[model samples]
Target chain A: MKIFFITSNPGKVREVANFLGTFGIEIVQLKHEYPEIQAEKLEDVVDFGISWLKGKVPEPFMIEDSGLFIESLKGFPGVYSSYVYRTIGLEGILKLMEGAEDRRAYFKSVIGFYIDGKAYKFSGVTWGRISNEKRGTHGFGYDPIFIPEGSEKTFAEMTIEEKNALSHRGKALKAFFEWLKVNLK
Target chain B: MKIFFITSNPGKVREVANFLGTFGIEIVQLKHEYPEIQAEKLEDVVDFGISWLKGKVPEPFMIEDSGLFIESLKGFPGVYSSYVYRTIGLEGILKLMEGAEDRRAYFKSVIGFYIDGKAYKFSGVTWGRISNEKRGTHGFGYDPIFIPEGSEKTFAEMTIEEKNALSHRGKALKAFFEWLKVNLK
Candidate 1:
């Protein structure tokens, strides 16, 4: 069976395709734009996107929204993480964290899946802390500045397989895959 | 004639009321909530809001959306200024700007007026720079840290009347009032 993923990011498509391919689920990228409302939670944004793309896109499709929330900064980039990343970049976040004692943070991902005219959501979270300085050269976005719990190396230091084992997106995808196994079969 | 101003901020209502009162326009505050989309432009947000509240609210109503865009930060907050202010606060913004050569910024406001089944937009802009330190005891939001062009005092240092002369919202309101004078009359 095949499922559509509505996103413009090719890297995300590759990651999802690689994971779902092993489970006999094909991931097809559907480049379409939808309105994301200014909401406090990622789930709300995903739900709104799914509703907006309900009839416009093919059925059995999915979309994902994720963000990084810092405890000290009061979730500075929360739902607007992407926009913040574009404007301030990783350097800006590190600058904001200067002289801060509390470095606790978390990465969260919410997946919105539409099937059989109904919407289903799966979510995952990975607790972590912001590092004092950027490290490694492997991953992207805030990966260089994030150190997951129980790991000394930043996410950027880990390979795709290593990071996926402890990533928010990876966990969410696993939950989604488990659901598909029970519901699709 | 009386017009509904959809907002939860009483201070904003007072400012509008004070401005329009002289022209015999009664400003009635209608506390209501509406969805604001995650758009790049303030006008888009206002347009979406007006469309959302069209039939649900009374006709001859207006809503305003505004943001502060920093040139050096590439409009870090932009349309999400309120959210950013709530999360990171002013200190975070200042930290991000530490050691930066450029401190140029601008405030913008967009007013959406729906009347007679059509939507109209009036916008205004005020260019300025970010202050090195918080100053003054008047105004609100980023007022203490924003210094309007050709003015030595921060917005918070000025009285309502003084700030209004160089404010983005004030300019937008002036344009809106001009339109009402021609059309409503």
Candidate 2:
């Protein structure tokens, strides 16, 4: 079975590709800009993306969106994560964390898979804390400062295989892969 | 002064066209699909459109987003109106209002104009009531079911000039026109 992963970020497609490599399912990256709606819930936003892009594309395709949400910020950068990271960057987020006791945060990813006019969703959440300062230079975006639970290294410090094993995007893609296994048979 | 009005609804472009004609400003219709985000406020969503489209297009353009907020539903389908209307349509809305007495609602519009790397916004609101059943065949979207304040007729019953003179979008566009008169020098 062949499917398209529509996203501009190669990193995400790579993660999904690695996850779905087992079932002989060809995961193709069709780099396209998908529309996202402003919503508090990731499911609602992903659902809209599925609806908007369903018939326009030829093959079954999937899209993923993630956010870095901080408990102190009250999910300030929830759906606005992409824009927030660009506007504020790691330095700005670190500044917001100054003198704050709670650095508890999480990165959440929601993947919407559209096939034959139906949409399926899988979500993954990585419990983590925002590091006090930027650390590591291997990853992109907020990766430099987020330490997943039970580990000291930020995602940027982890190997691709290591990060994908625990990353929010990886978990979601793996869940999608599991579904494909059951459905394809 | 001239500005581009980007929208898929020709009806909306028509309304703005009529409103701006008196000012000697050319309101060109740039009919295209613009991505909208889910937001609590119309202004925020329209602002995203402005930012995303400004440098991509050749001229100064504005986008308008409007929603029917039913007080009974606690202002649902507000910013989600476009998506809600498509999925549920008027029939589904009437279903939602079943057994509800307080059907009072209002239409709110936000217009975001992008020019010279900055975004300006104007908002207008029209108090109205959601009809018990869909009425008339004119206008678009929720027009068949929304009866504006001060008139028994729904927007669907009014002509282009008639509706545009006092519509939520009309009012918002007029406000933009007033701003343009002063600022677009």
Best model number under DockQ: 1
Candidate 2 on B1-185: residue-level lDDT in tens? 77888888787787888778887888888876656775567877787788778777757888888888888666766776664565446765776676779989999989988877788899898998888877777788899988888889988888888887768888888888889878875
Q: Which model scores highest in lDDT?
A: 1
Docking quality class, candidate 1: high
- Give the interface RMSD values of the models in order: 0.7, 13.6
lDDT of 1 by residue, A1-185 (tens): 99999988675676678778887999999999888899999999998899899999988999988889999999879999889999999988888888889999999989899998999999989999999989999867789999999999999998877787898888998999999989888
Say which docking band candidate 2 falls in.
incorrect
Q: Candidate 2's residue-wise lDDT over A22-117, tens digit each?
A: 668788988666668766778887888888787777678888888888887666567666655654467657766766798999999999988777
Candidate 2 segments whose C-alpha is farther than 4 A from its true place = B1-35, B38-185
Tens-place lDDT per residue, model 1, B41-115, is: 999999889988999987799998989999999997899999998998888888888888999999999989999
Supply candidate 2's per-residue lDDT for B41. Answer: 74
- Residue B54 in model 1: lDDT: 92
TM-score computed on alpha carbons, candidate 2: 0.56
Colliding pairs, model 2: A37-B37, A37-B38, A38-B37, A38-B38
C-alpha lDDT score of every prediction, in listed order? 0.90, 0.79
